[PDB]
Design a protein around this ligand. Structure first.
Ligand SMILES: NC(=O)c1ccc[n+]([C@@H]2O[C@H](COP(=O)([O-])OP(=O)(O)OC[C@H]3O[C@@H](n4cnc5c(N)ncnc54)[C@H](OP(=O)(O)O)[C@@H]3O)[C@@H](O)[C@H]2O)c1
Ligand SMILES: CCc1nc(N)nc(N)c1OCCCOc1ccccc1C[C@H](C(=O)O)C(F)F
Ligand SMILES: [Cl-]
Length: 186
């Protein structure tokens, strides 16, 4: 099992969600970036694992559930079994990470990607060990009801470039944004 990563897109006012949707209109290449980063495995024969909260799972359209080409895991303390279309369910991020060491997943999983929402990012960002944060900075304010926690810059470094990630400003539908990658070796 490989690296532990978070990936998120966040508006200038720290928003990630609104009424079960994204706060901004759909940004095709931001979606394509999310898909490619979380699907691409560095190891032949293996897939990446995506971990997500329950609300994030249900915010994905049923046609795109589970996220194709990745092993999906949902976090919830209320559900008694993984939701329809999912095969894994854990009570906490720590439980999910321990699950990756059992044979059913250790043989299959390369990278682990936390894909939201708010409380999952919070638990992950404080988790000890090596962690990278792939943060898309959406350079506008959008009305949101779900937010990304502020990054502790005493713990993380901001990398000027990361392989395969363009460092220049992007623009779609009149909205500019930028891909950032943070790292800690805690
Ligand atoms: N912009 C982005 O990058 C991005 C990414 C993801 C989602 N989103 C948006 O954000 C919203 C969803 O995020 P959200 O923060 O509202 O919800 P969420 O974190 O996806 O789901 C929250 C629920 O998941 C369970 N849960 C979450 N963290 C847990 C943890 N660490 N351990 C155990 N259970 C945990 C709990 O369910 P139980 O009560 O059943 O225990 C909790 O009520 C939607 O609007 C979605 O569109 C945006
Ligand atoms: C692309 C957004 C994103 N961008 C970065 N950089 N990181 C993330 N974690 C992230 O959220 C991915 C999970 C939340 O998804 C959604 C939630 C509400 C509405 C639509 C989606 C996208 C769906 C999907 O995810 O496939 C669907 F289009 F299929
Ligand atoms: Cl921040």
């Amino acid at each position: 099992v490989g690296s532990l990563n978070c990936i998120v897109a966040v508006s200038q006012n720290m928003g990630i969600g609104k009424n079960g949707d994204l706060p901004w209109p759909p940004l095709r290449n931001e979606f394509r970036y999310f898909q490619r980063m979380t699907t691409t495995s560095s190891v032949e024969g293996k897939q990446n694992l995506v971990i997500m909260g329950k609300k994030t799972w249900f915010s994905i359209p049923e046609k795109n559930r589970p996220l194709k080409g990745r092993i999906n895991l949902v976090l919830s303390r209320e559900l008694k079994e993984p939701p329809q279309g999912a095969h894994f369910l854990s009570r906490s991020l720590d439980d999910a990470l321990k699950l990756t060491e059992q044979p059913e997943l250790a043989n299959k999983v390369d990278m682990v990607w936390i894909v939201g929402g708010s409380s999952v990012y919070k638990e992950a960002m404080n988790h000890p060990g090596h962690l990278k944060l792939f943060v898309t900075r959406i350079m506008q304010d959008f009305e949101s009801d779900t937010f990304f926690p502020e990054i502790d810059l005493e713990k993380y470094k901001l990398l000027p470039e990361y392989p395969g990630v363009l460092s220049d400003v992007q623009e779609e539908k009149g909205i500019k944004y930028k891909f950032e990658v943070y790292e800690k070796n805690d």
